[PDB]
């Protein structure tokens, strides 16, 4: 077996919103996982002070969106391998073996298994396609609105079915680290 990628539940984190509400703001393209830059117009934001915006008109808003691993991902994660009761594409999840046909590395599909991809749990070269987009804020105080499809890891968890330890025929128990029958 060789390791293509690992996947787990992604953590939705948003940097703090820039409003310099007289002149335009410029963002920078970053190598973050599923990094997105958008600029937004007139919101005239409020904080607890209630007045953070000189030039009540002319407003510009900056917001960024990216995903990164949830802090529990060193335990609750799935490993995708390619390798007989084993199919050509197998999925390892906490000692349970599933013969899922996961998408290839670089071919991310939102709302499905393997929507976020990285080589290791500590790897910084994370790629993701979660179909995240930014919406125009309408309420008078400051916030970021965003809509996004659900985690395909949790949806695949729901429809995983039985693992290969009860699926593989000829009465043999699948054992993990390394994969074997």
């Amino acid at each position, epitope marked *: 077996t060789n390791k293509e990628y690992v996947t787990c539940r992604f953590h939705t984190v948003i940097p703090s919103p820039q409003v310099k509400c*007289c*002149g*335009s703001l*410029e*963002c*920078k*393209a970053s*190598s973050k996982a*599923d*990094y*997105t*830059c*958008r*600029v*937004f*117009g*007139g919101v005239y934001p409020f904080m607890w002070g209630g007045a953070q915006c000189f*030039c009540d*008109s*002319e*407003n*510009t808003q900056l917001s960024e969106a990216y995903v990164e691993f949830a802090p529990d991902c060193t335990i609750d994660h799935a490993v995708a391998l390619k390798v007989s009761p084993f199919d050509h594409k197998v999925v390892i999840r906490k000692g349970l073996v599933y013969n899922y046909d996961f998408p290839e590395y670089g071919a991310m599909k939102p709302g499905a298994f393997g929507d976020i991809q990285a080589s290791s749990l500590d790897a910084t070269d994370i790629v993701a396609r979660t179909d995240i987009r930014l919406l*125009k804020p309408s309420v008078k105080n400051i916030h970021v609105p965003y809509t996004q499809a659900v985690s395909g890891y949790e949806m695949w968890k729901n429809n995983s079915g039985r693992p290969l330890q009860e699926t593989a025929p000829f009465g043999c128990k699948i054992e993990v680290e390394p994969l074997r029958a």
Partner: antibody
Amino acid sequence: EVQLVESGAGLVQPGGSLRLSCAASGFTFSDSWMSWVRQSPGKGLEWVGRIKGKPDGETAAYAASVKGRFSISRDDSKNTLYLQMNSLKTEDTAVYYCTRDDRTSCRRGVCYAAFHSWGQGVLVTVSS
Amino acid sequence: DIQMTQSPSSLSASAGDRVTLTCRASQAISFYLAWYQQKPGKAPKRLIYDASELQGGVPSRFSGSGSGTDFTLSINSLQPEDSATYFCLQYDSPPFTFGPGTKVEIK
């Protein structure tokens, strides 16, 4: 306010070369996208080319009819925009503009920018 | 190349009435349309970028909305220094194409 001034245009021989200048001032020059705008008498507005910033590598895109003949050469020491055009055809007699592009969205890395600033425009005549 | 259409081309009106101007895009641009206008003998000026929100430097009577292939340019009051030729630009893929324009005049 972003100041963009054009100079260096005039009456030239067809099938030759010249060098005009767009001295950019009023912004951070090392991280802004520059584009050029061409206007025809009797037709609409035409795009020429785009260049990127210093972390991108100063690469240059171009239109369909200007590939291999136009050369944009920027320099950060004196903050001006140059255009080395060669093989002046009969369809290049126009009024040119130099523009500043601020980026509005960088969806998964690639950045898409509109046309934010503009110059006063100078006219070039390619005839005999 | 992405083709720009500009309909209509002659929408002369009076002050304070209802004028709606559109710019159809051919392929499925998400919201990347920028709205311009042109004084005669002057430089162009941008009005609305990202097709929904108002740029700083312009009054609040200009507004736009739309996504996909149909967009609008809603004018609240035709104050008589709005006599210009409105332009629309896509900035999604090269080459960036301008519309032919609409000569709106006020008499």
